């Protein structure tokens, strides 16, 4: 459907995701824990009844009317985790997630308030800038003709090098600033 690595969903992935969404919407339907745990083993039995189905077209049809079953029996407001998308605390602290380059725009009177921090940030940036051209020339010889096929990136191969396209993943803001 829409994924970074694969261009599709395998049938095994579709079965597992439908099982998970069915259990989550079921737990939304079935608030109490022993009651949900009873119906959860019942639903696990219903999913393991046709676990050993060899015919992929028949399993496709069974998965399709299982999606119809799940859509007919879904909860209108299922339990979303608070920091899950659709939750009450979701993306709440994104107004506190200042990007790191703004530290470069500080005045030197407040840069001198934290001397060890910026004295270490200088060699962090030094590390980034002497890693950049090596990881660019790493990516230019491994990428096939026509660009990269999948969005996944190779790791650091040599010893001493850093993995390519790493600075915004490493220096990302904390989830609770």
């Amino acid at each position: 459907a829409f994924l970074p690595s694969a261009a599709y969903l395998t049938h095994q992935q579709k079965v597992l995701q439908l099982y998970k969404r069915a259990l989550r919407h079921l737990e939304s339907r079935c608030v109490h824990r022993d009651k949900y745990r009873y119906f959860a083993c019942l639903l696990r039995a219903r999913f393991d009844e046709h676990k050993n189905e060899k015919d992929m077209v028949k399993a496709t049809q069974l998965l399709r009317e299982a999606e119809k079953e799940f859509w007919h029996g879904q909860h209108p407001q299922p339990y979303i985790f608070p920091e899950s998308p659709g939750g009450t605390s979701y993306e709440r602290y994104e107004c506190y997630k200042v990007p790191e380059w703004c530290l470069d725009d500080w005045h030197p009177s407040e840069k001198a308030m934290y001397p060890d921090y910026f004295a270490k940030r200088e060699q962090w940036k030094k590390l980034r800038r002497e890693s950049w051209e090596r990881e660019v020339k790493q990516l230019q010889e491994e990428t096939p003709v026509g660009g990269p096929r999948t969005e996944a990136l190779p790791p650091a191969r040599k010893q001493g090098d850093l993995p390519p396209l790493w600075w915004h993943i490493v220096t990302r803001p904390r989830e609770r600033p």
Binding site: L16, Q17, Y19, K20, R24, R44, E83, S84, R176
Partner: protein, 87 residues
């Protein structure tokens, strides 16, 4: 409020959940025990284990990551990634 998570704490809690699971014996369970190949579980059981992690720690692991967590060490490393432990 909001107590700090540690890799000792995340490790001990993930293993504490998996030792309360009736298809994993508490004597063969290690920190690198693979779910399908070493503990002999199903992908259905693996989805139930990742949903038990979601029940344990109070957040959600998406399915593109839930389809690949195949040891307790990957679970501890993923929660370390999504919680920023050992500051």
């Amino acid at each position: 409020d909001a107590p700090p998570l540690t890799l000792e704490g995340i490790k001990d809690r993930v293993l504490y959940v998996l030792k309360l699971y009736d298809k994993i014996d508490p004597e063969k369970l290690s920190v690198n025990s693979h779910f399908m190949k070493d503990l002999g579980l199903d992908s259905l059981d693996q989805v139930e284990i990742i949903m038990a992690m979601e029940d344990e720690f109070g957040f959600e692991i998406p399915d593109i990551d839930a389809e690949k967590l195949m040891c307790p060490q990957e679970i501890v490393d993923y929660i370390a990634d999504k919680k920023d432990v050992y500051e």
